[PDB]
Design a binder for this molecule. Structure first.
Ligand SMILES: FC(F)(F)c1nnc(S)n1/N=C/c1cccc(Br)c1
Ligand SMILES: [Ca+2]
Ligand SMILES: [Ca+2]
Ligand SMILES: [Zn+2]
Ligand SMILES: [Zn+2]
Length: 231
């Protein structure tokens, strides 16, 4: 779509004055090329990243795009669970000197999932909000653990000062006919987790997700409606 920029294999789209979506693609062999989206946030004199790309090389291209187009240091990255689309590029972040954060559970599961763990672990209260001492200096990033759904470790992030919340792989677009890859899913708690994400970011009107283009809040309720049928 017009307005989008390509750098290498990555596509970028501005969502807000200080927010961009990054999109990377993995070619399952002779199968569907599969898109995955993350976010880039300009916070004053620094940049914050949400999710790697599928690969280290694709991840370096994110970082090089930021250097060329924004020209501010990346202070940290938060990754949203231990699958290849979200943590495939951790080695690239580390090679670049970025501090990395993930749900403690993501870091614990990372080895079995064939992912490199992030450096630092987020933990969460019973109400789902990140324990702030584990997410120091996150600026406008508000990190919320909605409960198990796409995976037991899936986390979400709202961007304060914008209309944007990022549901990662938990949320599907409002015309989706399935819930995608359920290989690590919790089918019993999924619906409640989708709804909890909506409740955490009641003011968000643009919902960004890993595997569809940004949607309205309709994505949340539609996802929950699908998930209701798993139980
Ligand atoms: F549209 C799809 F199919 F891409 C999708 N929608 N929701 C989910 S989750 N997916 N797939 C996610 C996925 C596919 C291959 C490998 C890994 Br690791 C994750
Ligand atoms: Ca690697
Ligand atoms: Ca798995
Ligand atoms: Zn996933
Ligand atoms: Zn995914």
């Amino acid at each position: 779509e017009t307005g989008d920029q390509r750098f290498g294999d990555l596509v970028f789209r501005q969502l807000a004055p200080n927010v961009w979506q990054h999109t990377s693609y993995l070619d399952m062999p002779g199968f569907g090329a599969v898109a995955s989206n993350g976010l880039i946030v300009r916070d004053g004199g620094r940049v914050l990243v949400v999710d790697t790309a599928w690969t280290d090389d694709q991840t370096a291209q994110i970082l090089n795009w930021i250097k060329q187009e924004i020209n501010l240091p990346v202070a940290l990255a938060v990754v949203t669970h231990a699958h290849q689309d979200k943590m495939g590029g951790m080695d690239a972040l580390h090679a670049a000197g970025i501090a990395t954060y993930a749900n403690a559970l993501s870091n614990q599961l990372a080895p079995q999932e064939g992912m490199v763990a992030a450096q630092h672990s987020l933990t969460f209260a019973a109400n789902g909000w990140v324990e702030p001492a584990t997410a120091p200096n996150f600026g406008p990033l508000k990190v919320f653990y909605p409960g198990p759904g796409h995976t037991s470790d899936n986390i979400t992030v709202g961007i304060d000062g914008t209309d944007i919340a990022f549901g990662g792989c938990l949320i599907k677009d409002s015309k989706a006919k399935s819930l995608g890859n359920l290989g690590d899913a919790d089918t019993e708690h999924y619906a409640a987790s989708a709804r909890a994400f909506g409740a955490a970011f009641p003011k968000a009107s643009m919902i960004v997700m890993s595997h569809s283009a940004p949607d309205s809040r309709a994505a949340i309720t539609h996802t929950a409606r699908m998930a209701d049928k798993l139980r």
